[PDB]
């Protein structure tokens, strides 16, 4: 559980959707269960890009997601 997430999709972290939209699809394709339901084990990989790249478009999360995993500690965020 010690792996970055902005780079997990070969990106820049400061990017936005432009790369997270070609990186999320370019790297998830390798797992895109929509077609790869023969195993569906990719369903979790989404937690690798969709859980990581989910904040690669915003900034307030870039500070939360880059260290507090996924809103780990958030009462009124």
């Amino acid at each position: 559980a010690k792996q970055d997430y902005y780079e997990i999709l070969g990106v820049s972290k400061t990017a936005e959707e432009r790369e997270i939209r070609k990186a999320y699809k370019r790297l998830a394709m390798k797992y895109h269960p929509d077609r790869n339901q023969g195993d569906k084990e990719a369903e979790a990989k989404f937690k690798e890009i969709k859980e990581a790249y989910e904040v690669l478009t915003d900034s307030q999360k870039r500070a939360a997601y880059d260290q507090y995993g996924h809103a780990a500690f958030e009462q009124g965020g």
Side-chain angles (χ1 to χ4, degrees), residues 21-63:
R21 87 180 307 172
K22 217 285 309 210
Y24 171 108
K25 165 188 247 224
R26 172 72 112 224
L27 239 291
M29 194 119 158
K30 247 102 287 216
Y31 319 117
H32 245 201
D34 166 50
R35 80 175 70 214
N36 275 81
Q37 286 119 340
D39 218 66
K40 309 174 229 166
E41 62 177 337
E43 178 159 323
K45 239 118 249 172
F46 271 14
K47 85 119 279 209
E48 301 277 300
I49 301 102
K50 211 290 218 114
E51 137 67 70
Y53 115 134
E54 140 153 8
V55 358
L56 267 178
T57 122
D58 193 6
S59 86
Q60 66 208 233
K61 314 168 126 209
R62 295 290 266 71

